[PDB]
Structure formats: C-alpha cells, structure tokens
C-alpha cells in the first residue's frame, strides 16, 4: 500500500540530497575557477539525478493509480496522491533549477535536456494539482483537506522564484 510509496519517496529524497551536494560542489567549482569539463561532469551528474527522479515519479504515479483503483478508503487514496505530489515537487524543483543553472552557465546541451524533464514534470504538477483540489472538495477530513492545500502551495513554490 502506502509503504511502497514511501520507499520510492525515500529514494527521491536521497537523490535530492545528492543533487544538493552536487549543487554545492558546482558553486565551489565556479568560485575557484575550475575548468569547463569539471563543471560539465558536475552538471552531467545532476542531469542523471534529474532523469532518475523522473523515472521514480513515473513509477510513483503507477502505484498511485493502483491505489486509486483498488483502495476503498478515501483517506488512504488521498494520502497516496499527497505522497505522489511530494515526488512531483522534488522532480520539478531540481529539474527546473538544473535547466536554469545550465542556461546561466552556457551549457545548452544540458539545459535542453533538463528543460525536457522540467516540461514533463510541469504537466505532472498540473495533473496532480487538479487531483489535489478534487480531494479538498471530496474528502471531509480537515487534516487531509489541510494537507492538500499545503501540497498545492508546495508545488507552486517552485514557479514563484523562477
């Protein structure tokens, strides 16, 4: 049930933590004037993280479709979508930033690939936002309604800075 969703999400969190460390290394490499190929290799690893995040989010989505089709509990179905919304948030956050980072540094190849993941993540974000709003209207649980509200705010927090 939800345990498998948590397992996939832990992988995404460890991938997000590696992404943050690489972002740290990338900043220090620029500050010290590291060669261009050193930055490319750091950007490539971040791209590979972005692609693994997308693969996980697609996996997370299939498991949520199974929960939404079989689970009779509306609160359990809502929690599945809330967990999937967190995964989509992780995917969009890192892929959108990697695109912007690669563009600012002048790596069109990596910016274009990251942009493709961000655009796919954006359609996933919009789809899960529709389901999140439908949960607030359909599930009477105040904490599940509150959680759907925050998960929307979470997903929208990326596009504010961008």
């Amino acid at each position: 049930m939800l345990d498998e969703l948590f397992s996939l999400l832990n992988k995404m969190f460890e991938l997000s933590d590696k992404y943050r460390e690489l972002r740290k290394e990338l900043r220090k490499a620029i500050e010290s004037g590291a060669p261009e190929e050193e930055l490319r290799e750091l950007l490539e690893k971040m791209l590979e993280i972005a692609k693994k995040l997308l693969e996980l989010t697609k996996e997370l989505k299939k498991l949520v479709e199974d929960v939404l089709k079989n689970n009779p509990d509306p609160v359990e179905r809502a929690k599945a979508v809330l967990l999937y919304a967190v995964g989509v948030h992780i995917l969009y956050s890192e892929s959108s930033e990697l695109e912007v980072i690669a563009e600012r540094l002048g790596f069109k190849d990596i910016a274009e690939k990251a942009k493709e993941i961000a655009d796919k993540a954006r359609e996933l974000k919009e789809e899960v936002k529709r389901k999140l709003r439908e949960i607030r209207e359909e599930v009477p649980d105040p904490e599940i309604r509150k959680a759907a509200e925050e998960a929307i705010e979470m997903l929208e927090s990326n596009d504010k800075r961008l």
């Binding site: 999400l9 969190f13 943050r20 929690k79 992780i90 980072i101 959680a147 925050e150 979470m154 800075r161």
Partner: peptide
C-alpha cells in the same frame, strides 16, 4: 537569483517532515 544552499535544505526538510506527517497520521 539562485536560492541559498540552506534554503534548498529547508525545502527538503519541509517536504520530508510533510511525508513523515502523512505516515504517522
């Protein structure tokens, strides 16, 4: 403008705390 390393860490902490809330509620 790029968000700071710590602000990035807070966003991950909030998302993790959110997921942790879901499985203990």
């Amino acid at each position: 403008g790029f968000t700071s390393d710590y602000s990035k860490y807070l966003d991950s902490r909030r998302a993790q705390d959110f997921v942790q809330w879901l499985m203990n509620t």
